[PDB]
Amino acid sequence: GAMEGILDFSNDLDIALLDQVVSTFYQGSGVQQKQAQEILTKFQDNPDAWQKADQILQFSTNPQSKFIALSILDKLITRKWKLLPNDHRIGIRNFVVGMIISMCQDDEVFKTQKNLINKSDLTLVQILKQEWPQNWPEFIPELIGSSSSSVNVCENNMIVLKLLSEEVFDFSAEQMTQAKALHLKNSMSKEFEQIFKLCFQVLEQGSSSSLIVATLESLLRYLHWIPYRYIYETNILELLSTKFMTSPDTRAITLKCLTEVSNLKIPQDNDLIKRQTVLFFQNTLQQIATSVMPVTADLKATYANANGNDQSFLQDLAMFLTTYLARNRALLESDESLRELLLNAHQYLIQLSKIEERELFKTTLDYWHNLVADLFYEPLKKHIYEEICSQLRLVIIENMVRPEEVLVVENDEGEIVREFVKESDTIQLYKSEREVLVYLTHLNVIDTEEIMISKLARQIDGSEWSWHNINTLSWAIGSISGTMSEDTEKRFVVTVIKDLLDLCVKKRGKDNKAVVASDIMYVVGQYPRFLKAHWNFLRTVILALFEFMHETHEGVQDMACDTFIKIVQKCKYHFVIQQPRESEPFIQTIIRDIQKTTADLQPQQVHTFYKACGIIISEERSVAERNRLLSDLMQLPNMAWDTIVEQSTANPTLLLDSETVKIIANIIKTNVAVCTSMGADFYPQLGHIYYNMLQLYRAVSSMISAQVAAEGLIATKTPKVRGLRTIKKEILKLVETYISKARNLDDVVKVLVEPLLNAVLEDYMNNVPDARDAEVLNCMTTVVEKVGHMIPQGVILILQSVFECTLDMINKDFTEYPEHRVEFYKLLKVINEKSFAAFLELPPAAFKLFVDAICWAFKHNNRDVEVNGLQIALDLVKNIERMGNVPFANEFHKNYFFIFVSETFFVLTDSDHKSGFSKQALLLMKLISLVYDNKISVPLYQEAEVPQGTSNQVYLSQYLANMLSNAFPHLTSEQIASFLSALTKQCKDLVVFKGTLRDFLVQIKEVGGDPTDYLFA
Amino acid sequence: QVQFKLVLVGDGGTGKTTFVKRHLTGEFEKKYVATLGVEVHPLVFHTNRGPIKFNVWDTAGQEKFGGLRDGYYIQAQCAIIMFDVTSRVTYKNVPNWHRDLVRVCENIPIVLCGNKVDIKDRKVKAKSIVFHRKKNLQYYDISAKSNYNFEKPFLWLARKLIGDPNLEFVAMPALAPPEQYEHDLEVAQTTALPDEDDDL
Amino acid sequence: IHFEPVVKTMEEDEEVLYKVRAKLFRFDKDAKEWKERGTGDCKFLKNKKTNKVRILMRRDKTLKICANHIIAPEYTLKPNVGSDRSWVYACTADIAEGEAEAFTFAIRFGSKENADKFKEEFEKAQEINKK
Ligand SMILES: *[C@H](CC(=O)O)C[C@@H](O)/C=C/C(C)=C\[C@H](C)C/C(C)=C/C=C/[C@@H](O)[C@H]1C[C@@H](O)[C@H](C)[C@H](/C=C/C)O1
């Protein structure tokens, strides 16, 4: 098309055409915009495109064209600057400086082309980073002088200085070498006195809001690093906290400066510096009260109105007040005359804390936690804040977010429904609120009870009744469990439960009953101490929970199950013993009525119920009694199981129907549930079903294969085959669950393992990829983890069955078979950790695949895989090293040392594996340290490839210099040699070593990096 | 038509394109095809104050596909900065994206979004996410996969841009609808629906 | 003495015959894959003036329409190979995005029961539209 013309550099650049393409991209749409975008990207990425920059700057009538022109220069400046001849550098500098001057002089442009001037200034800063001060010593003085001569230029100088401070102090860590960063920070430090002098003068002269605002913006940056004396030994605190607070244009930025000042490094023993720290706060709070709003103002309302910049201002006020008070409030606590100020500051925070804005609330809550935690320990402080704390109790109680346990919510129709999902993001908020509220309760338990009991009274009588009001209250009441005395709690919980029971009678309809039910369940589950002490109450609660297991409201039902297990986890002892005036332990009563009790529950709820019973049963430590309870608990599933192990043993095809497959799955799921809570105690039940279970695993496996053969791979998607695989998966989960908690490892090895391996391994190996269950690998990891040391031949067998066939599934790309990928490297890790001999038994060809597999893991972006890959590599090296000077260790190094070194370097330097840096560096340090310490007994080089007797150290350096030279040909030999010298000398100090690697990663991105940077220390 | 330029930035693989596609068509794209430079998509929402149109500039997060980079931000009226709560490096880089963005766009409403909260093994803890406070950015936990808070960034931005805190999304009106194939249906029947183990 | 005091979804003329939560997919023919189009309440709406029954489905939170078409007498609910809780069927005139367009839809539900109940109702609506 016509637009492609600009890509032909053999002809002169048509600036008009460039402007057309640019405005087509920025102001057009559809296919024309898409085409223009590609053209511009290609234009920009053309390595000679920068030579067109001056031409574009001079002759273009489009600001975006000139912007793109500057991006092209920026890329040149930051990457290839030292490649240029010296006159081109002078030239580029001159027309950048000249353009800035020119655009500042012309008022019209200065006003309307702010994007372009800011971009021009950043580009200037890039030149400074390369050239300043060494080849430009007069930049700052000439900048300072030029300021006096024009208000537009002075203002823009402040922008340039802001950006320079940013680039040097705030964003240099990743982008420069340690040595260059130090150089530029020192350079700014040495000339700062003059920079500040101009800054102070402008602030004092106080002419032009936009110049003042720009000056304060630069100051905000300077405050990240400048010495405190510039702030405390000049009049600058007075100006910030009075003058600049009064004007709204300068108020935003001044508050942020004052927040940063509150963080400066400051002597703790100087009475005067303390007085100055008090005064600026006092000034600032006075200007807010007189110029912005009084302490009584409704900040909730103001924020919600969202006029102008009010929300951002209130946000910044919160940040200032919380930052200052966290550090300095002690300065205000002892002087009687400073008390009004202390409390006014906190009263503003109380008002800020009422704003409806989650993230702001978190900021304030962080502060309250800091306060109350301090009042909990610091002697004689809490009385000061008694009125503040009392108001805080109200704010927190009235803004309690729904706890994870409460499973009901309100929908748009005004109906109380079960939630669709978990409110994942309010979990942390609840914890924080609870923490503060617990502290406040300890600080004044009388005040808290009174507030809650009377709030509750106003729910009953109806004066303040609402779902919102009863919920927040109920959540708050549950959240302070543990704060009161057992006796106060006794009376408290009694009163609260009486009231909530009264509330349930009063408020009818499914919605009101769901709300009140949820709240009572949350409270009772939160006070197990009370439940332990009050059996009749406990029993009645549990029976009440069982009634809810029959509710048609599914939310209430599900919470009944969760509350049941929550109670049981804490109170199980009281279910297992026979209570006074009861004919039997309540566990006996529960098991007996289990069919009736669980009859309306969904299966996963039935499994939770069973899991709870398992918790109780494991309280019984007499083995005879425990096993009997286990057997009684499992009666229904064992009976269903027994009848299926006959029917399906008669008709291997009867597994065809959905209903039987669902039944079987639920039977095994029930076993998993009970095994989860009983752990080692589950064994006898595992023994009842084990062999038939493994036979079932084989039968189901045959069915899956039969179906895939008859229907194709698509069969694996069908409900039928998915149901059969579910059975195999649950069987594997059950065995995993048991072995992971087993205490008798001898029985695991002598009874469980051989039949397990027989049932699962060949089946995995001989199914097509799409039919292999990644869960097999997961089960095997637990087997190796727990008994691998006892089953060396079994480990060999596991490897043989899964290693090559899984590797071939996952080594074509990074995405196919994600679960297998993850479980595969988990299994290799534990085998390498626990049964390294298994790898020694592999033939050389398969061992090579192992090494391939490890390095393949290095190259994953997926963290699960990547991390294990690095760990395996490190553990492997340690395993070899442990063998000492024997032929396998020798051949290992000869074959694979340099493969690991080069592969580790590749992921270190490719810019796509940055999350792995720490472990990559550790691995590389280990590898280099092996040679540096002469822990490799044989030469790493071929005979005659280098002179005889040549040390491995000398050869390593030679190999690496060659490797880097070819991998990074734009580096000089001196850069490489210096890098390697440092890196190799620093191979005992991970912190310094990592620094040197990071410096290398900076230098590979540019040309002409200084090799002396690697001497940094 | 009232339309606003929204630029969307963040590290490669954080879920920018997937988030936008979800809003555009309703789909969840499982594959990672890196964006090359920028993709521009119109995206309309119906509100109680009329239709608001975002022209979404979904930019490339991978450095090698960055294209014009900050050149994309010119004249943006709002922004979303995206990171991945399962990847800490992506949160570490938020200040860098914010820096490059506000240098070109000095006073615009910006939402910070932590994506992929559907994933069990979360790495960037809730408690750690504080960068937004001093920079006045709105923050949300989101998931483009589970649709957790997926609408919140646009609801907030629309409130800020229209200047009405009480703005709500409203149901678009439903026009009465009007009144070989056998090959096409059979291929559809025999292609399995994805994610058969989800709730819906 | 009188004291002066201080000073369209397009579904108002429709009866809701059936409502269920669903996830709706459309078949991309080119790439052979189902892509999600929306999750929310699928409703059967009978117009009071014409007695015609349509499917209207809106996405949660955004409320954007992902399905809007007459329940044509000719359509046929068909099983997907991967699911016992979905139906696939061909639609020749859905107007959710705007202009009248043909799609192959798949619609999945919370349970098989919900799927079966949907089909029962789909067929009932078809008999209404026949009258
Ligand atoms: C609705 C009730 C209604 O009126 O219909 C709510 C109800 O369905 C839910 C009840 C739940 C989940 C728990 C209750 C707390 C269980 C009950 C009713 C326990 C009753 C216990 C009484 O013995 C109780 C009465 C009070 O005087 C106090 C609590 C004493 C406690 C002495 C230690 O005993």
Ligand SMILES: Nc1nc2c(ncn2[C@@H]2O[C@H](COP(=O)(O)OP(=O)(O)NP(=O)(O)O)[C@@H](O)[C@H]2O)c(=O)[nH]1
């Ligand atoms: N689990 C999960 N995965 C997600 C989510 N959002 C996106 N993804 C996945 O993350 C991968 C990358 O998504 P993509 O939208 O391409 O990210 P991007 O930020 O646009 N990458 P780029 O900047 O290179 O264009 C895809 O595989 C996608 O399915 C999410 O919320 N949860």
Ligand SMILES: [Cl-]
């Ligand atoms: Cl511009």
Ligand SMILES: [Cl-]
């Ligand atoms: Cl106990």
Ligand SMILES: [Cl-]
């Ligand atoms: Cl050299």
Ligand SMILES: [Mg+2]
């Ligand atoms: Mg993308």
